[PDB]
Amino acid sequence: GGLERFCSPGKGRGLRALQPFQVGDLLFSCPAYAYVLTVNERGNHCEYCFTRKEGLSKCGRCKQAFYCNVECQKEDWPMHKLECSPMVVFGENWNPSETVRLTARILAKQKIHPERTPSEKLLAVKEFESHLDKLDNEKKDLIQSDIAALHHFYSKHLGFPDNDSLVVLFAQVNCNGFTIEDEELSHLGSAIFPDVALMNHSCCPNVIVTYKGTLAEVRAVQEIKPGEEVFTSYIDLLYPTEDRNDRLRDSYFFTCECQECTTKDKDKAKVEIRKLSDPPKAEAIRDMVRYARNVIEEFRRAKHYKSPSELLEICELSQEKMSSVFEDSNVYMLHMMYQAMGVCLYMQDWEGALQYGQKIIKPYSKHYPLYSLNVASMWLKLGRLYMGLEHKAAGEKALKKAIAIMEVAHGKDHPYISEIKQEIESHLEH
Ligand SMILES: Nc1ncnc2c1ncn2[C@@H]1O[C@H](CSCC[C@H](N)C(=O)O)[C@@H](O)[C@H]1O
Ligand SMILES: [Zn+2]
Numbered sequence: 001g002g003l004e005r006f007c008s009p010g011k012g013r014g015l016r017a018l019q020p021f022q023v024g025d026l027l028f029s030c031p032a033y034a035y036v037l038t039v040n041e042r043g044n045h046c047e048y049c050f051t052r053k054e055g056l057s058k059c060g061r062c063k064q065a066f067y068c069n070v071e072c073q074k075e076d077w078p079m080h081k082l083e084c085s086p087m088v089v090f091g092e093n094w095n096p097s098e099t100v101r102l103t104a105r106i107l108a109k110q111k112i113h114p115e116r117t118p119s120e121k122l123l124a125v126k127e128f129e130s131h132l133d134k135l136d137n138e139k140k141d142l143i144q145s146d147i148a149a150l151h152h153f154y155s156k157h158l159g160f161p162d163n164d165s166l167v168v169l170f171a172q173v174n175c176n177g178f179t180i181e182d183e184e185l186s187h188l189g190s191a192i193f194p195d196v197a198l199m200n201h202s203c204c205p206n207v208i209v210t211y212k213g214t215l216a217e218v219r220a221v222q223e224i225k226p227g228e229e230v231f232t233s234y235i236d237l238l239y240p241t242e243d244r245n246d247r248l249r250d251s252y253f254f255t256c257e258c259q260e261c262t263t264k265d266k267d268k269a270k271v272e273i274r275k276l277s278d279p280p281k282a283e284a285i286r287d288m289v290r291y292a293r294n295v296i297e298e299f300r301r302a303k304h305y306k307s308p309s310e311l312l313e314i315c316e317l318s319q320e321k322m323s324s325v326f327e328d329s330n331v332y333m334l335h336m337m338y339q340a341m342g343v344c345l346y347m348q349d350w351e352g353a354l355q356y357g358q359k360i361i362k363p364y365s366k367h368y369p370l371y372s373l374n375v376a377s378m379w380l381k382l383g384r385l386y387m388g389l390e391h392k393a394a395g396e397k398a399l400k401k402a403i404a405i406m407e408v409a410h411g412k413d414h415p416y417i418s419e420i421k422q423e424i425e426s427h428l429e430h
Protein backbone atom coordinates (compact mmCIF):
# COMPACT_ATOMS: atom_id res chain seq x y z
CA GLY A 1 0.00 0.00 0.00
CA GLY A 2 1.42 3.34 1.16
CA LEU A 3 4.40 1.58 2.73
CA GLU A 4 8.03 0.86 1.85
CA ARG A 5 10.72 -1.78 2.39
CA PHE A 6 14.02 -0.19 3.42
CA CYS A 7 17.30 -0.85 5.24
CA SER A 8 16.94 0.08 8.89
CA PRO A 9 20.48 0.65 10.26
CA GLY A 10 21.39 -2.09 12.74
CA LYS A 11 17.95 -3.71 12.32
CA GLY A 12 18.24 -5.33 8.86
CA ARG A 13 15.21 -4.87 6.62
CA GLY A 14 12.17 -2.90 7.81
CA LEU A 15 8.88 -1.26 6.93
CA ARG A 16 8.68 2.54 6.64
CA ALA A 17 5.66 4.78 6.09
CA LEU A 18 5.26 6.78 2.87
CA GLN A 19 2.10 8.48 4.18
CA PRO A 20 0.69 9.45 7.61
CA PHE A 21 -1.26 6.87 9.64
CA GLN A 22 -3.53 7.82 12.53
CA VAL A 23 -4.27 5.68 15.57
CA GLY A 24 -6.55 2.82 14.45
CA ASP A 25 -5.80 3.11 10.72
CA LEU A 26 -5.34 -0.15 8.81
CA LEU A 27 -1.78 -0.26 7.43
CA PHE A 28 -2.46 -3.51 5.56
CA SER A 29 -3.68 -7.05 6.04
CA CYS A 30 -1.68 -10.13 5.06
CA PRO A 31 -3.19 -13.57 4.27
CA ALA A 32 -1.60 -16.64 5.84
CA TYR A 33 1.07 -18.37 3.75
CA ALA A 34 0.91 -21.51 5.92
CA TYR A 35 -1.00 -22.21 9.15
CA VAL A 36 -2.11 -24.90 11.63
CA LEU A 37 -4.68 -25.31 14.36
CA THR A 38 -3.32 -26.58 17.70
CA VAL A 39 -4.20 -30.17 18.61
CA ASN A 40 -6.15 -28.92 21.64
CA GLU A 41 -8.44 -26.62 19.62
CA ARG A 42 -9.59 -29.50 17.39
CA GLY A 43 -13.39 -29.69 17.57
CA ASN A 44 -13.87 -26.13 18.81
CA HIS A 45 -12.54 -24.38 15.70
CA CYS A 46 -12.72 -25.13 11.98
CA GLU A 47 -9.40 -26.60 10.85
CA TYR A 48 -9.57 -24.47 7.68
CA CYS A 49 -11.01 -21.01 8.45
CA PHE A 50 -10.42 -20.89 12.25
CA THR A 51 -14.10 -20.18 13.03
CA ARG A 52 -15.30 -21.16 16.50
CA LYS A 53 -18.60 -23.05 16.14
CA GLU A 54 -20.36 -25.91 17.94
CA GLY A 55 -21.75 -27.73 14.87
CA LEU A 56 -18.66 -29.09 13.11
CA SER A 57 -18.30 -32.25 11.03
CA LYS A 58 -15.19 -34.46 11.00
CA CYS A 59 -13.22 -36.56 8.48
CA GLY A 60 -14.40 -40.05 7.59
CA ARG A 61 -10.89 -41.43 8.16
CA CYS A 62 -8.96 -39.59 10.89
CA LYS A 63 -11.92 -38.15 12.88
CA GLN A 64 -9.28 -35.69 14.14
CA ALA A 65 -10.07 -32.71 11.87
CA PHE A 66 -13.21 -30.58 12.03
CA TYR A 67 -14.77 -28.22 9.49
CA CYS A 68 -17.66 -25.77 9.08
CA ASN A 69 -18.88 -27.78 6.08
CA VAL A 70 -17.86 -29.67 2.92
CA GLU A 71 -16.38 -26.50 1.36
CA CYS A 72 -13.97 -25.90 4.26
CA GLN A 73 -12.94 -29.58 4.18
CA LYS A 74 -12.03 -29.70 0.46
CA GLU A 75 -10.07 -26.44 0.69
CA ASP A 76 -8.09 -27.77 3.67
CA TRP A 77 -7.55 -31.23 2.17
CA PRO A 78 -4.25 -30.52 0.35
CA MET A 79 -2.82 -29.55 3.76
CA HIS A 80 -4.79 -32.10 5.79
CA LYS A 81 -3.81 -35.01 3.50
CA LEU A 82 -0.41 -34.67 5.17
CA GLU A 83 -1.82 -35.97 8.44
CA CYS A 84 -5.23 -37.56 7.94
CA SER A 85 -3.69 -40.96 7.15
CA PRO A 86 -0.59 -40.66 9.38
CA MET A 87 -2.88 -39.87 12.30
CA VAL A 88 -4.61 -43.20 11.66
CA VAL A 89 -1.36 -45.17 11.10
CA PHE A 90 0.65 -43.78 14.03
CA GLY A 91 -2.53 -43.21 16.06
CA GLU A 92 -1.19 -43.23 19.62
CA ASN A 93 2.35 -42.16 18.66
CA TRP A 94 1.43 -39.18 16.49
CA ASN A 95 3.19 -36.30 18.27
CA PRO A 96 4.96 -33.87 15.94
CA SER A 97 5.60 -30.44 17.49
CA GLU A 98 3.56 -27.52 16.15
CA THR A 99 6.75 -26.19 14.48
CA VAL A 100 7.08 -29.47 12.54
CA ARG A 101 3.36 -29.39 11.72
CA LEU A 102 3.74 -25.82 10.40
CA THR A 103 7.02 -26.50 8.57
CA ALA A 104 5.30 -29.39 6.78
CA ARG A 105 2.58 -26.95 5.62
CA ILE A 106 5.24 -24.53 4.32
CA LEU A 107 7.05 -27.28 2.39
CA ALA A 108 3.76 -28.46 0.89
CA LYS A 109 2.84 -24.89 -0.09
CA GLN A 110 6.23 -24.37 -1.78
CA LYS A 111 5.70 -27.46 -3.92
CA ILE A 112 2.17 -26.52 -5.05
CA HIS A 113 3.05 -22.80 -5.31
CA PRO A 114 6.70 -22.01 -6.22
CA GLU A 115 5.83 -18.48 -7.39
CA ARG A 116 5.58 -15.45 -5.09
CA THR A 117 2.23 -15.59 -3.26
CA PRO A 118 -0.06 -12.62 -2.51
CA SER A 119 1.41 -12.98 1.03
CA GLU A 120 4.99 -12.12 0.06
CA LYS A 121 4.61 -8.62 -1.42
CA LEU A 122 7.69 -7.18 0.32
CA LEU A 123 9.32 -10.09 2.15
CA ALA A 124 9.50 -13.61 0.74
CA VAL A 125 9.61 -16.76 2.86
CA LYS A 126 12.87 -17.73 1.14
CA GLU A 127 14.28 -14.34 2.18
CA PHE A 128 13.57 -14.79 5.92
CA GLU A 129 16.47 -14.15 8.28
CA SER A 130 17.70 -17.35 9.95
CA HIS A 131 20.51 -16.29 12.34
CA LEU A 132 22.25 -19.68 11.82
CA ASP A 133 25.58 -18.21 12.99
CA LYS A 134 24.16 -17.21 16.39
CA LEU A 135 22.58 -20.55 17.36
CA ASP A 136 24.13 -22.70 20.08
CA ASN A 137 24.40 -26.51 19.94
CA GLU A 138 21.18 -26.99 21.95
CA LYS A 139 19.08 -25.18 19.31
CA LYS A 140 20.87 -27.00 16.47
CA ASP A 141 19.98 -30.31 18.15
CA LEU A 142 16.33 -29.32 18.63
CA ILE A 143 16.27 -28.45 14.91
CA GLN A 144 17.88 -31.80 14.05
CA SER A 145 15.25 -33.83 15.92
CA ASP A 146 12.57 -31.62 14.33
CA ILE A 147 13.86 -32.78 10.94
CA ALA A 148 13.74 -36.45 11.99
CA ALA A 149 10.18 -36.03 13.32
CA LEU A 150 9.23 -34.45 9.98
CA HIS A 151 10.82 -37.36 8.09
CA HIS A 152 9.08 -39.78 10.47
CA PHE A 153 5.50 -38.49 10.20
CA TYR A 154 5.41 -36.73 6.80
CA SER A 155 7.38 -38.92 4.34
CA LYS A 156 4.24 -40.47 2.80
CA HIS A 157 3.10 -37.23 1.11
CA LEU A 158 6.06 -34.80 1.10
CA GLY A 159 9.40 -34.78 -0.72
CA PHE A 160 12.17 -33.34 1.43
CA PRO A 161 15.04 -31.11 0.29
CA ASP A 162 18.51 -31.86 1.72
CA ASN A 163 19.04 -31.76 5.50
CA ASP A 164 20.94 -28.45 5.38
CA SER A 165 18.01 -26.77 3.63
CA LEU A 166 15.52 -27.90 6.29
CA VAL A 167 17.89 -26.58 8.98
CA VAL A 168 17.63 -23.12 7.39
CA LEU A 169 13.83 -23.37 7.10
CA PHE A 170 13.31 -24.46 10.73
CA ALA A 171 15.52 -21.61 11.94
CA GLN A 172 13.48 -19.23 9.78
CA VAL A 173 10.22 -20.41 11.38
CA ASN A 174 11.50 -19.91 14.95
CA CYS A 175 12.52 -16.36 14.03
CA ASN A 176 9.64 -15.24 11.79
CA GLY A 177 6.75 -17.48 12.89
CA PHE A 178 3.54 -16.10 14.35
CA THR A 179 1.12 -17.54 16.90
CA ILE A 180 -2.58 -16.95 16.33
CA GLU A 181 -4.64 -15.85 19.35
CA ASP A 182 -8.35 -15.39 19.99
CA GLU A 183 -10.05 -12.66 22.06
CA GLU A 184 -8.80 -14.03 25.39
CA LEU A 185 -5.25 -14.43 23.97
CA SER A 186 -5.81 -18.19 23.83
CA HIS A 187 -3.43 -20.09 21.53
CA LEU A 188 -5.28 -21.14 18.35
CA GLY A 189 -2.37 -22.23 16.18
CA SER A 190 0.77 -21.19 14.34
CA ALA A 191 1.14 -19.40 11.00
CA ILE A 192 3.48 -17.61 8.58
CA PHE A 193 2.73 -14.06 7.43
CA PRO A 194 5.76 -12.96 5.34
CA ASP A 195 4.72 -9.31 4.91
CA VAL A 196 4.05 -8.81 8.64
CA ALA A 197 7.37 -10.49 9.47
CA LEU A 198 9.09 -7.50 7.82
CA MET A 199 8.26 -5.26 10.81
CA ASN A 200 10.93 -4.75 13.48
CA HIS A 201 10.59 -4.62 17.27
CA SER A 202 10.01 -1.79 19.68
CA CYS A 203 8.79 -2.06 23.26
CA CYS A 204 7.09 1.15 22.13
CA PRO A 205 5.31 -0.19 19.05
CA ASN A 206 3.27 1.98 16.74
CA VAL A 207 1.26 -0.90 15.31
CA ILE A 208 -0.63 -3.95 16.55
CA VAL A 209 -0.96 -7.29 14.77
CA THR A 210 -4.44 -8.76 15.06
CA TYR A 211 -6.31 -11.66 13.42
CA LYS A 212 -9.57 -12.14 11.53
CA GLY A 213 -9.55 -15.91 11.15
CA THR A 214 -6.40 -16.78 9.21
CA LEU A 215 -5.94 -13.20 8.01
CA ALA A 216 -3.47 -10.97 9.87
CA GLU A 217 -4.15 -7.23 9.97
CA VAL A 218 -1.92 -4.38 11.14
CA ARG A 219 -3.30 -1.23 12.75
CA ALA A 220 -1.60 1.89 14.10
CA VAL A 221 -1.59 2.43 17.88
CA GLN A 222 0.39 5.68 17.49
CA GLU A 223 0.42 8.57 15.00
CA ILE A 224 2.91 7.54 12.32
CA LYS A 225 4.69 10.27 10.34
CA PRO A 226 6.05 9.78 6.80
CA GLY A 227 9.63 8.48 6.97
CA GLU A 228 9.12 6.75 10.33
CA GLU A 229 9.75 3.02 10.65
CA VAL A 230 6.87 0.74 11.60
CA PHE A 231 7.37 -1.31 14.79
CA THR A 232 5.42 -4.10 16.44
CA SER A 233 6.27 -5.83 19.71
CA TYR A 234 7.57 -9.39 19.48
CA ILE A 235 7.14 -9.90 23.21
CA ASP A 236 4.88 -9.36 26.24
CA LEU A 237 5.46 -5.75 27.39
CA LEU A 238 4.61 -6.32 31.08
CA TYR A 239 8.09 -7.37 32.14
CA PRO A 240 11.25 -5.38 33.07
CA THR A 241 13.75 -4.34 30.38
CA GLU A 242 16.17 -7.10 31.42
CA ASP A 243 13.45 -9.81 31.34
CA ARG A 244 12.37 -8.38 27.98
CA ASN A 245 15.83 -8.26 26.38
CA ASP A 246 16.64 -11.70 27.80
CA ARG A 247 13.81 -13.09 25.65
CA LEU A 248 14.87 -10.98 22.66
CA ARG A 249 18.50 -12.13 22.71
CA ASP A 250 17.49 -15.78 23.06
CA SER A 251 14.74 -16.03 20.42
CA TYR A 252 15.53 -13.20 17.99
CA PHE A 253 19.21 -12.40 18.69
CA PHE A 254 19.30 -8.66 19.43
CA THR A 255 19.18 -6.14 22.27
CA CYS A 256 16.40 -3.55 22.02
CA GLU A 257 17.44 0.09 22.27
CA CYS A 258 14.16 2.02 22.13
CA GLN A 259 13.23 4.83 24.55
CA GLU A 260 11.70 2.35 26.99
CA CYS A 261 14.84 0.17 27.15
CA THR A 262 17.31 3.07 27.36
CA THR A 263 15.59 5.12 30.09
CA LYS A 264 14.07 2.14 31.95
CA ASP A 265 11.25 4.58 32.84
CA LYS A 266 8.75 1.87 33.81
CA ASP A 267 11.18 -0.64 35.36
CA LYS A 268 10.97 0.76 38.92
CA ALA A 269 7.15 0.54 39.08
CA LYS A 270 7.23 -2.98 37.56
CA VAL A 271 9.59 -4.31 40.24
CA GLU A 272 7.75 -2.48 43.04
CA ILE A 273 9.46 -2.99 46.41
CA ARG A 274 7.41 -2.77 49.62
CA LYS A 275 7.98 0.66 51.17
CA LEU A 276 8.50 -0.14 54.87
CA SER A 277 10.73 0.17 57.96
CA ASP A 278 14.15 -1.31 57.18
CA PRO A 279 14.00 -1.02 53.36
CA PRO A 280 15.05 -4.42 51.91
CA LYS A 281 18.68 -4.35 50.78
CA ALA A 282 19.83 -4.63 47.14
CA GLU A 283 20.97 -8.18 47.95
CA ALA A 284 17.54 -9.31 49.25
CA ILE A 285 15.82 -7.85 46.19
CA ARG A 286 18.34 -9.43 43.79
CA ASP A 287 17.56 -12.74 45.57
CA MET A 288 13.78 -12.43 45.26
CA VAL A 289 13.90 -11.38 41.60
CA ARG A 290 16.01 -14.46 40.87
CA TYR A 291 13.52 -16.56 42.87
CA ALA A 292 10.66 -15.03 40.85
CA ARG A 293 12.17 -15.47 37.37
CA ASN A 294 13.12 -18.93 38.61
CA VAL A 295 9.73 -20.05 39.92
CA ILE A 296 8.09 -18.78 36.71
CA GLU A 297 10.29 -21.18 34.72
CA GLU A 298 9.51 -23.93 37.26
CA PHE A 299 5.77 -23.37 36.77
CA ARG A 300 6.01 -23.39 32.95
CA ARG A 301 7.46 -26.93 33.09
CA ALA A 302 5.08 -28.05 35.86
CA LYS A 303 1.79 -27.10 34.18
CA HIS A 304 2.30 -29.92 31.65
CA TYR A 305 2.08 -32.79 34.16
CA LYS A 306 1.20 -31.41 37.63
CA SER A 307 -2.39 -31.44 38.91
CA PRO A 308 -4.40 -28.23 39.63
CA SER A 309 -3.82 -28.52 43.41
CA GLU A 310 -0.04 -28.86 42.91
CA LEU A 311 -0.04 -25.86 40.57
CA LEU A 312 -2.24 -23.78 42.89
CA GLU A 313 0.18 -24.59 45.72
CA ILE A 314 3.13 -23.36 43.61
CA CYS A 315 1.23 -20.13 42.90
CA GLU A 316 0.25 -19.74 46.56
CA LEU A 317 3.62 -20.51 48.17
CA SER A 318 5.50 -18.30 45.68
CA GLN A 319 3.04 -15.44 46.27
CA GLU A 320 3.53 -15.86 50.02
CA LYS A 321 7.35 -15.94 49.82
CA MET A 322 7.47 -12.95 47.44
CA SER A 323 5.01 -10.98 49.64
CA SER A 324 7.84 -10.24 52.10
CA VAL A 325 9.46 -7.87 49.57
CA PHE A 326 7.10 -7.27 46.63
CA GLU A 327 3.87 -5.28 46.44
CA ASP A 328 0.88 -6.73 44.56
CA SER A 329 1.53 -4.35 41.63
CA ASN A 330 4.89 -6.11 41.20
CA VAL A 331 5.04 -7.81 37.79
CA TYR A 332 6.19 -11.19 39.17
CA MET A 333 3.24 -11.06 41.54
CA LEU A 334 0.85 -10.41 38.66
CA HIS A 335 2.34 -13.36 36.74
CA MET A 336 1.75 -15.96 39.48
CA MET A 337 -1.68 -14.43 40.10
CA TYR A 338 -2.44 -14.66 36.37
CA GLN A 339 -1.33 -18.30 36.33
CA ALA A 340 -3.47 -19.10 39.40
CA MET A 341 -6.37 -17.48 37.53
CA GLY A 342 -5.70 -19.88 34.64
CA VAL A 343 -5.96 -22.88 36.98
CA CYS A 344 -9.14 -21.52 38.60
CA LEU A 345 -10.66 -21.09 35.13
CA TYR A 346 -9.76 -24.70 34.35
CA MET A 347 -11.47 -25.90 37.54
CA GLN A 348 -14.77 -24.10 36.80
CA ASP A 349 -14.01 -22.12 39.99
CA TRP A 350 -15.35 -18.91 38.46
CA GLU A 351 -15.48 -16.87 41.70
CA GLY A 352 -11.84 -17.71 42.45
CA ALA A 353 -10.79 -16.74 38.92
CA LEU A 354 -12.62 -13.41 39.24
CA GLN A 355 -10.84 -12.40 42.47
CA TYR A 356 -7.41 -12.92 40.86
CA GLY A 357 -8.66 -10.92 37.87
CA GLN A 358 -9.72 -7.92 39.96
CA LYS A 359 -6.38 -7.93 41.80
CA ILE A 360 -4.45 -7.67 38.51
CA ILE A 361 -6.47 -5.36 36.23
CA LYS A 362 -5.25 -1.98 37.54
CA PRO A 363 -1.48 -2.66 37.61
CA TYR A 364 -1.91 -4.12 34.10
CA SER A 365 -3.20 -0.75 32.85
CA LYS A 366 -0.19 1.07 34.34
CA HIS A 367 2.41 -1.38 33.01
CA TYR A 368 1.17 -1.98 29.46
CA PRO A 369 0.72 0.71 26.77
CA LEU A 370 -2.72 2.34 26.41
CA TYR A 371 -3.65 0.06 23.48
CA SER A 372 -2.74 -3.46 24.57
CA LEU A 373 -4.40 -6.79 23.76
CA ASN A 374 -3.32 -8.21 27.14
CA VAL A 375 -5.34 -5.52 28.92
CA ALA A 376 -8.36 -5.87 26.64
CA SER A 377 -8.18 -9.66 27.01
CA MET A 378 -8.12 -9.34 30.81
CA TRP A 379 -11.09 -6.96 30.70
CA LEU A 380 -12.92 -9.47 28.53
CA LYS A 381 -12.26 -12.37 30.94
CA LEU A 382 -13.49 -10.19 33.83
CA GLY A 383 -16.55 -9.17 31.82
CA ARG A 384 -17.58 -12.77 31.14
CA LEU A 385 -16.83 -13.87 34.71
CA TYR A 386 -18.86 -11.00 36.16
CA MET A 387 -21.64 -11.61 33.64
CA GLY A 388 -21.85 -15.33 34.51
CA LEU A 389 -21.81 -14.62 38.25
CA GLU A 390 -24.81 -12.25 38.06
CA HIS A 391 -22.74 -9.03 38.07
CA LYS A 392 -24.27 -7.45 34.97
CA ALA A 393 -23.35 -3.84 35.78
CA ALA A 394 -19.65 -4.57 36.39
CA GLY A 395 -19.73 -7.05 33.50
CA GLU A 396 -20.95 -4.52 30.94
CA LYS A 397 -18.40 -1.96 32.18
CA ALA A 398 -15.60 -4.51 31.77
CA LEU A 399 -16.89 -5.57 28.34
CA LYS A 400 -17.10 -1.93 27.21
CA LYS A 401 -13.50 -1.33 28.32
CA ALA A 402 -12.55 -4.31 26.14
CA ILE A 403 -14.36 -2.82 23.11
CA ALA A 404 -12.63 0.54 23.73
CA ILE A 405 -9.17 -1.00 23.06
CA MET A 406 -10.37 -3.55 20.48
CA GLU A 407 -12.06 -0.92 18.28
CA VAL A 408 -8.65 0.63 17.66
CA ALA A 409 -6.72 -2.67 17.58
CA HIS A 410 -9.11 -4.94 15.64
CA GLY A 411 -11.08 -2.21 13.83
CA LYS A 412 -14.63 -1.05 14.65
CA ASP A 413 -16.19 -3.80 12.52
CA HIS A 414 -14.28 -6.91 13.72
CA PRO A 415 -16.40 -10.08 14.25
CA TYR A 416 -14.99 -10.15 17.82
CA ILE A 417 -16.52 -6.74 18.57
CA SER A 418 -19.87 -7.94 17.21
CA GLU A 419 -19.75 -10.88 19.66
CA ILE A 420 -19.01 -8.71 22.70
CA LYS A 421 -21.72 -6.17 21.86
CA GLN A 422 -23.99 -9.19 21.43
CA GLU A 423 -22.98 -10.55 24.85
CA ILE A 424 -23.95 -7.16 26.30
CA GLU A 425 -27.37 -7.08 24.59
CA SER A 426 -28.12 -10.66 25.72
CA HIS A 427 -28.45 -9.31 29.28
CA LEU A 428 -30.60 -6.21 28.64
CA GLU A 429 -34.11 -5.50 27.31
CA HIS A 430 -35.46 -2.32 25.70
N1 LIG B 1 14.64 -3.51 17.69
C1 LIG B 1 15.50 -4.27 16.97
N2 LIG B 1 16.83 -4.04 17.00
C2 LIG B 1 17.70 -4.79 16.29
N3 LIG B 1 17.32 -5.82 15.50
C3 LIG B 1 16.00 -6.16 15.37
C4 LIG B 1 15.00 -5.38 16.12
N4 LIG B 1 13.80 -5.91 15.83
C5 LIG B 1 14.01 -6.93 14.97
N5 LIG B 1 15.32 -7.09 14.69
C6 LIG B 1 15.91 -8.11 13.79
O1 LIG B 1 14.92 -8.61 12.88
C7 LIG B 1 14.63 -10.00 13.12
C8 LIG B 1 13.11 -10.21 13.19
S1 LIG B 1 12.36 -10.38 11.60
C9 LIG B 1 12.18 -8.69 11.12
C10 LIG B 1 12.73 -8.48 9.71
C11 LIG B 1 14.26 -8.41 9.74
N6 LIG B 1 14.70 -7.05 10.15
C12 LIG B 1 14.85 -8.76 8.41
O2 LIG B 1 15.78 -8.09 7.94
O3 LIG B 1 14.45 -9.73 7.76
C13 LIG B 1 15.32 -10.34 14.44
O4 LIG B 1 15.87 -11.67 14.42
C14 LIG B 1 16.40 -9.29 14.61
O5 LIG B 1 17.66 -9.71 14.07
ZN1 LIG C 1 -14.53 -23.26 8.09
Ligand SMILES: [Zn+2]
Pocket residue numbers: 059060061062063064065080084085
Ligand atom coordinates in the same frame (compact mmCIF):
# COMPACT_ATOMS: atom_id res chain seq x y z
ZN1 LIG D 1 -9.02 -36.88 7.99
Ligand SMILES: [Zn+2]
Pocket residue numbers: 202203204256257258259260261
Ligand atom coordinates in the same frame (compact mmCIF):
# COMPACT_ATOMS: atom_id res chain seq x y z
ZN1 LIG E 1 12.68 -1.87 23.80
